[PDB]
Amino acid sequence: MQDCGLPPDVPNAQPALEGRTSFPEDTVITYKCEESFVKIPGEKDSVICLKGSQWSDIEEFCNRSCEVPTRLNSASLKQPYITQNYFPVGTVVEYECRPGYRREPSLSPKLTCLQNLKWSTAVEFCKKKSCPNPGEIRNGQIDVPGGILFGATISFSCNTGYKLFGSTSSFCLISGSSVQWSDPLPECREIYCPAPPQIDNGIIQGERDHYGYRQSVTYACNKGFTMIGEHSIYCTVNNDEGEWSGPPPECRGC
Amino acid sequence: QDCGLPPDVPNAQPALEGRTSFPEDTVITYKCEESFVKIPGEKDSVICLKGSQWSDIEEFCNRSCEVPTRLNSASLKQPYITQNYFPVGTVVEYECRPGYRREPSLSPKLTCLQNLKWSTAVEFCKKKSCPNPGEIRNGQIDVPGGILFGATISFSCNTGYKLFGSTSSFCLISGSSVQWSDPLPECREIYCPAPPQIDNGIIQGERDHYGYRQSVTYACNKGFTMIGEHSIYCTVNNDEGEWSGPPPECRGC
């Protein structure tokens, strides 16, 4: 009769019958691979009802493949693997470095789909690029806790008696073609104490315009006056603020 | 042949030894009464002569000041320093003791006043001053009470420095002047012991010396995680350098 019965049984595939058991001549039935199976590119996945109530032949067209290679932050799949989804056992794909990573020549940038439907062990075939030498801060220091490679962080400090002006840290970020420091080297500025205090009936011996950390000012009483106290005070520097070591002496008369 | 009582001399008293009769040739000496001093080059005694007659004697006592009181700033000049006769109007001269100096604007003279008292005393001989103490680098000099003769001064060394030498100085009289008993001490920078190195980590830019408040920063080698403070700093404790705490640790991953 001008009708075919059930289409052939294909291993690891299921036909779409749309709720019927009888099909008219020329009816085309498509099969869908079952779970954990991917259709093999360049293969028939459907049958057709021909004359005599006979279906056209169809061969197994499903496998048995790995999943799409896992997402790496250092490397991207090369074409054409980056657009594929069919990865039967033995399939080997190639990677290429992302930015800012570069090839580690001693290691292969290839992964293979293993018998267990898993990709081979990952190695660091694409390593992190390195930022330029941080350099130096005059009268300050740079803290490099964990190298200067892509993603690294560094901090800046200013030695005792100096005040930091600018960024207090820097990160090695990807900069277009390469990786560069997010922020420039700051400045360590000399902290000044407030002008030294003057005293009644006494003077400051050779007063300077500016006084820095540990710099001292010496007092002297006027003729006829007796000094009671410290002959000199010095600049103490704490939490980036200048402050004199103590009060100035006193000059008592007569 | 015996003389009777010797003549009455104003402001003087004779020494009779309880006697009322005296044999020829007896010599009787008089002593000036209180507040009175015998006048140099004058007779103070009488003698019993023939005819039961005493030799003549004239008043020989002039009211006089006492020997000037001792001053610690000056001393009587010669010849006043050996005199005891100071009638009203007598003016003596002083000269400075050590360690004192003359106050040009003033007079070093005292006058015996009508009331038998010396004139008002002024500071004509003033305490000498030692030279300006000067400066101690990285230290201080405390001048509690001036730098005149007899004064004391103390020395200290700022935080992070240790004093080496004298801790005080006294203004002494030194021959023809006054000088500080002790020379200035030196304030030397205290160094902490070399910072400790750590396994699988380094010191970032180690220095040769570390002083007070100076810090050393650590960094772990690739593949190691730091455990503890990233940097430590040089503390000072009774002139000794000591690190703020232990260095971090670098744990294998």
* Contact of B145 with A226, CB cutoff 8 Å: yes
Residues B23 and B54 in one domain: yes
Shortest alpha-carbon distance between residue B112 and chain A (Å): 29
Which of A64, A84, A115 is at the close of a domain? Answer: A64
* Contact of B108 with B101, CB cutoff 8 Å: no
- Which stretches does DSSP call E strand in A84-231? 92-97, 101-103, 110-112, 126-128, 140-143, 153-158, 162-165, 169-175, 178-181, 187-190, 202-204, 216-221, 226-230
Q: Report which residue type is found at B209.
A: H
Nearest to B217 among A141, A218, A249 (CB): A141
Length of chain B: 253
Which of B127, B162, B178 is at the close of a domain? Answer: B127
| Residues from A in contact with B at Cβ < 8 Å | 141-147, 159-160, 214, 216, 218, 220, 226-234, 245, 249
Residues B120 and B147 in one domain: no
In b/e form, how buried is each residue of A210-219, taking b as 16+ CB within 10 angstroms? ebebbebbbb
Best of B138, B140, B158, B250 to mutate (most A CBs within 10 Å, chain A): B140
| Resolution attained, angstroms | 2.3
Residues of chain A with Cβ-Cβ distance to B141 below 8 Å are 230-232
Q: Which of B103, B5, B104 is nearest to B46 (CA)?
A: B5
Residues A5 and A52 in one domain: yes
Question: Is the Cβ pair B213, A160 closer than 8 Å?
Answer: yes
**Which are the contacts of B97, defined by CB distance < 8 A and separation ≥ 6?**
B71, B72, B73, B74, B75, B125
What would the two tokens of residue B80 be? Answer: 């006043």
Question: Is the Cβ pair A230, B141 closer than 8 Å?
Answer: yes
Segment holding A33, helix H or strand E = strand A28-33
- Which stretches does DSSP call E strand in A34-131? 38-39, 46-50, 54-55, 62-63, 75-77, 92-97, 101-103, 110-112, 126-128
Domain span including residue B165: 128-190
CATH of the domain at A96: 2.10.70.10
**Number of domains chain B is built from:** 4
Question: Is the Cβ pair A231, B205 closer than 8 Å?
Answer: no
Segment holding A24, helix H or strand E = strand A23-24
Residues B120 and B133 in one domain: no
Which of B102, B127, B152 is at the close of a domain? Answer: B127
User: What is the three-class DSSP state of A83?
Assistant: helix
Residues B45 and B1 in one domain: yes
SS (H, E, C) chain B: CCECCCCCCCCEEECCCCCCCECCCCEEEEEECCCEEECCCCCCEEEEECCCEECCCCCCEEEECCCCCCCCCEEECCCHHHCCCCECCCEEEEEECCCEEECCCCCCEEEECCCCCECCCCCCEEECECCCCCCCCCEEEEECCCCECCCEEEEEECCCEEEECCCEEEEEECCCCEEECCCCCEEEECECCCCCCCCCEEECCCCCCCECCCEEEEEECCCEEEECCCEEEEEECCCCEEECCCCCEEEEC
**Which are the contacts of B65, defined by CB distance < 8 A and separation ≥ 6?**
B86, B87, B88, B90, B112, B113, B116, B117, B118
Residues B143 and B106 in one domain: no
Distance, CA of B86 to CA of B80 (rounded, Å): 9
Residues A223 and A252 in one domain: yes
Method: X-ray
Residues A144 and A174 in one domain: yes
Distance, CA of A248 to CA of A245 (rounded, Å): 9
